[PDB]
Design a protein around this ligand. Sequence first.
Ligand SMILES: *[B@@]1([O])O[C]([C]C([O])=O)[C]=[C][C][C]1[N]C(=O)[C]C1=[C][C]=[C]S1
Length: 262
Amino acid sequence: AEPFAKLEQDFGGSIGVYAMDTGSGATVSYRAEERFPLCSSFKGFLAAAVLARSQQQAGLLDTPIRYGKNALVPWSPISEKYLTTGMTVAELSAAAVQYSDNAAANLLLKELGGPAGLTAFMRSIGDTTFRLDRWELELNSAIPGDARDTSSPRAVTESLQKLTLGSALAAPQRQQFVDWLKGNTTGNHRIRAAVPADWAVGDKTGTCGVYGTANDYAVVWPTGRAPIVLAVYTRAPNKDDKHSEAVIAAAARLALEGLGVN
Ligand SMILES: *[B@@]1([O])O[C]([C]C([O])=O)[C]=[C][C][C]1[N]C(=O)[C]C1=[C][C]=[C]S1
């Protein structure tokens, strides 16, 4: 734990890490059961919830979703770009996961019954820690001591494992979820930066923009070996504290090293 302690002291905040090697059964934990803000990392689980619903509702993924300028909140690059084209549930899901599109996230939350709807999905797969309470962009406030819109690194990792590798999703939906995570564009300097270039990685990042609060979770497939699942979350005491991608990458390296994975 000393390397993690040194890392968060250099960073000037708190770091939460949980990692599991699904081959060896080994785990690494540091503040793994503390709460950290989700920021955009909830958007991965949001896409999973959509996929789960699509198992029972034919045509859900291809359903056109109506939105205009009014729905476009800051950082909606894809939904703004394709406003004229039109977007479906599936396209919004890809946008939320891979570009962290905020309007897409809100539109999908609405289809699922809001933050409460997504929280109930996570409950249904056995996640008692996850809570989403607000919409974009209020959910990014990341106030120290505030449990709203938080989870723990361990719960995040366990739920991610259930959805990508376990049986929480039917096989086709599981693979679609994996493919969306693999295609994420926002995580190249976080967990992926700690991983050898020929290992397959799927991830979703989060960046609140305040209180040094940012994160990443991932499934990593070492070549020819069983996958690793891990979560790295950070926060800091003051509103204007900067988050650090290098710190997330470093924490992921420490996690991999702790599992004895090279
Ligand atoms: B969110 O957390 O996702 C991040 C990108 C990421 O995946 O790390 C950035 C924009 C959408 C979400 N964040 C916010 O809405 C607050 C903002 C932080 C920077 C610009 S907006």
